[PDB]
Design a binder for this molecule. Structure first.
Ligand SMILES: COc1ccc(NS(=O)(=O)c2cccc(NC(=O)c3cc(F)cc(F)c3)c2)c(F)c1
Ligand SMILES: COc1ccc(NS(=O)(=O)c2cccc(NC(=O)c3cc(F)cc(F)c3)c2)c(F)c1
Lengths: 544, 544
């Protein structure tokens, strides 16, 4: 019976004497293993499988039998497991293997349960819930509507809070708000188990998501609510609607920008071109891309007290028409007006349409790739940036690797190793003339876990932009002299527990300064708080 | 919590009103399905996977979440699921994916636990256990020693008692007696969890298996003990040691022969060549092959009261030297002397070495393939049998299909549809000149489940050869006039519950006649007993 409880089961780690005492002698094969030995064994069982999706299926089975062993395996092989346990494998599992999520602790909402949301939460019988991940399966990148099968996205994200910040796996809740699906295959699929209708309109959407926030705030009062993988028609509006009234954030919007800003300011430090001397092409002019630019400006203003207006003038925003300027004779979308050039004539605007001529005119020191239109950063463009700086900063952030603006390999080759590169995705190192270069991956894992752990300990009334900026700065400052010497823009991913504890500490101190913190038991000075935060984290080791 | 109990979990079959009452509204996606709908959905999830081993892995996951749904899926698609849930996929799962068995209810014995066997059984906390499958992983066919990974063979076989005869899945126990392994890969594999030593010698082997039988007889007194997949050096000796003192049998030896005999007597009925007019080449002279011949003789003697001596003279036994005769000038192994020809000269014996000349001399009406040396039944041999009978009986029983003596397709083609064929393995039908022929598969599933259900109800003191013969005859008699008209040698496999109930009834009546039955509550007349046996079977339907 202890064997059948995944939270306390140790499998072959139960000693002979423990097996005799627990009456489980003969329920296990005779070999006794340490946790490290069980991890090496699982890692081999995983690499037996060739397909990401079968590796995932194997790890799901470990998770349902031995939760400690699962999280211990992830933490020993984090960089390699991350693309299997979340993006992009988790989406493929949701889309075509949703049965992998059936036995997990999801909470399912829909219009049929209108007015019962709070009873459904009370009935789940969870104690002091710390983190709730919710999706409607609409997808941030707008591809492959998963409807009800979105529950797997919430399950995978909840697992990254546990692995990344030692949120107790008993105190995380994955939610699907099923407001229907526009997935035509699913609408006609006899085996789709969700609401078989097109996505509700906005008024009914917000009636249900309002009830969910109010029910969660009453029944899970200690929880952080994190919006995952909501489509662009809703994700920005959801934060505007809830950010002040509930303890909530959106990792896709706020996490991404905090991690990219941290990495970019370290690229500036390495580049020899100080923040006010940077000329930054922002290739892509969506709301997300502009939010990342603004996050960069906000962090450089916090860390260096340059006037934010002067930081904004380092940005050269490029949409599908070309360089965004006040003189090019169109009515600009609201988000584009802030970053619009005021220093460019109508006549020059007309000659600044293709990325190549924009780069030749602007003479940038940085290329930020947020475009999602393939390999726009060509050899010619990259060799033009080498004319403006000894250390071109090149960030191909468009997902997946096929949408990327340039490969890190070409960035390094074309610059003879001078390029400073951050990627959305992991890449193998590149060796040029005996010298090795590897891009810095700005993974969202750097920030959301520590925001979750900080907000779980501090119990703030809400999560204002100040806490995200603090988490951005905290992450920047964790890149050591030694990391920076080796060209790293972030502390190492494998150190995620120490990263999360430090992000959490800084978030807590910021909540304490703003007096929005509801937990008065916490220390109020950084050294003592950091020790207290570390002690509070759940660890994937056998404890009893 | 009801959802997390695989025995009572109904998943999406819980109605809306049931979900509200059980407080699980919002723990499931909103679609409500019947069991039949859940089965169709699972069957599609299974056929999504291309590889037998991934289909198995999928079915294992269903089994660990919803036991009723698992057994309902097997019974709806039995013929197609059988090669996935047992031979040959179960062996490949044991050999390379033993982690699939970790979460199942195995009991593990080894020399380290000597003298504790009964405490290990008492600690398992099972109530009125009916069926125990035990293996040591040595393998009947002597290939791929699995050691401790043999537990998966016991697990799969236990599952066939539940599916086949409605043994309650709570009342079956899979056992591995780990007496070491001769698998060199495993002896050197850091991840082998069993006893890391060569197989114990016979004296220590029997010390441990003795303690197991005595402990099982005391702690699981109502159980049938069935030996599965033991190597030829032990399997015959084990039955000789235990058959009278304990309630036990070996499916590989006794099950096989009872099913082959049933099918062969139906082939005789269809062939127009009555039992005393049959001339049977037994291609293969191992103990198993001779036991099958003797099972045939024993059944024809029971059903027809021909003198058994006259039935024995229909057999022409062929070993690696050639036709087994009293005059060929070697000292015959004991098992070969009974079937030795007394009517063949030393001079003819010398000219009867190759199967071709043996067939030309003997002029057989039947070829029994138990040889395990590939496709020995050639076009020439098959067309020679067409000279001796209008309906050649051709049974290629050697496993797997590559060791088989002939394909059913060639048997039918070469005889223009006249051949009466039984196979070890399923084959697709063959169409010749617009007429369709399909071989009869003599699956062991026809007999062991009903022997298990009969011995579970009757609680006989032991399982004498009389009960196996009765089960053989019972199975023969279940092939209806209609089945026989269509060329079927066995009732249909999909009817396995009715088959098992009828086999069980006949086994019980035989135990009652021999006064070895310990359960006095049972009816003693066939019609009333059969109704009572049917009522007692566990059914894979939702009941509460
Ligand atoms: C893919 O799933 C995996 C699960 C566990 C492990 N490793 S392990 O070391 O946890 C282990 C090793 C071998 C056997 C057990 N057995 C059990 O945990 C067990 C549980 C039960 F609920 C009832 C039971 F009888 C026995 C565990 C694994 F590598 C894969
Ligand atoms: C491969 O495994 C399968 C398992 C179940 C089904 N079908 S089903 O109809 O049983 C079903 C359908 C959808 C969801 C649930 N959920 C649960 O059974 C469940 C259990 C728990 F222990 C806790 C929990 F919160 C929920 C079940 C399946 F096709 C595959």
């Amino acid at each position: 019976a202890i064997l059948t409880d995944r939270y306390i089961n140790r499998g072959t780690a139960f000693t002979m004497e423990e097996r005799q005492k627990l009456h489980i002698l003969g329920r296990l094969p005779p070999v006794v293993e340490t946790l490290e030995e069980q991890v090496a064994r699982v890692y081999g069982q995983v690499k037996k499988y060739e397909k990401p999706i079968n590796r995932y299926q194997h790890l799901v089975s470990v998770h349902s039998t031995n939760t400690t062993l699962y999280y211990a395996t992830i933490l020993a092989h984090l960089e390699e497991m991350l693309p299997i346990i979340y993006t992009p494998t988790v989406g493929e599992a949701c889309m075509e293997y949703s049965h992998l999520f059936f036995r997990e602790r999801g909470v399912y909402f829909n219009r049929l349960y209108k007015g019962q949301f709070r009873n459904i939460m009370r009935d789940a019988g969870y104690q002091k819930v710390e983190v709730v991940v919710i999706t409607d399966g609409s997808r941030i990148l707008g591809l492959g509507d998963l409807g009800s099968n979105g529950i797997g996205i919430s399950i995978g994200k909840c697992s990254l809070y546990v692995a990344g910040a030692g949120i107790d796996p008993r105190l995380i809740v994955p939610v699907i708000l099923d407001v229907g699906t526009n997935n035509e295959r699913y609408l006609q699929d006899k085996d789709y188990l969700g609401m078989r209708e097109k996505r509700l309109g906005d008024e009914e959407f917000y009636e249900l998501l309002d009830e969910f926030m109010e029910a969660a705030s009453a029944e899970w009062p200690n929880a952080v609510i994190q919006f995952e993988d909501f489509s662009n028609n809703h994700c920005f509006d959801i934060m505007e609607r809830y950010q002040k009234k509930y303890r909530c954030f959106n990792d896709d919007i706020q996490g991404t920008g905090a991690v990219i800003a941290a990495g970019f300011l370290n690229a500036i430090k390495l580049s020899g071109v100080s923040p006010l001397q940077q000329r930054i092409v922002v290739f892509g002019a969506g709301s997300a891309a502009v939010g990342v630019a603004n996050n960069i400006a906000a962090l450089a203003a916090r860390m260096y007290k340059f006037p934010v207006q002067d930081l904004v003038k380092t940005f050269y925003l490029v949409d599908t028409k070309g360089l965004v300027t006040t003189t090019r004779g169109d009515q600009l979308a609201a988000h584009k007006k802030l970053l619009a050039r005021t220093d460019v004539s109508a006549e020059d605007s007309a000659k600044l349409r293709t990325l190549e001529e924009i780069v030749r005119f602007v003479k940038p020191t940085t290329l930020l790739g947020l475009g999602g239109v393939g390999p726009a950063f060509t050899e010619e463009i990259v060799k033009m940036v080498m004319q403006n700086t000894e250390r071109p900063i090149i960030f191909p952030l468009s997902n997946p690797t096929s949408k990327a603006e340039v490969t890190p390999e070409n960035a390094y080759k074309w610059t003879n190793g001078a390029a400073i590169v951050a990627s959305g995705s992991p890449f193998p190192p590149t060796t040029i003339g005996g010298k090795t270069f590897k891009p810095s991956q700005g993974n969202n894992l750097y920030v959301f876990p520590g925001v979750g752990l900080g907000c779980a300990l501090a119990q703030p009334t809400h999560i204002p932009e100040e806490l995200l900026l603090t988490a951005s700065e905290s992450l920047n400052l964790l890149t050591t002299e030694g990391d920076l010497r080796e060209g790293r823009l972030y502390p190492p991913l494998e150190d995620i527990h120490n990263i999360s504890a430090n992000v959490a500490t800084d978030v807590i101190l910021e909540a304490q300064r703003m007096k929005i913190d509801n937990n008065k038991k916490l220390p109020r000075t950084r050294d003592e708080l950091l020790a207290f935060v570390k002690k509070a984290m759940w660890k994937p080791v056998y404890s009893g």
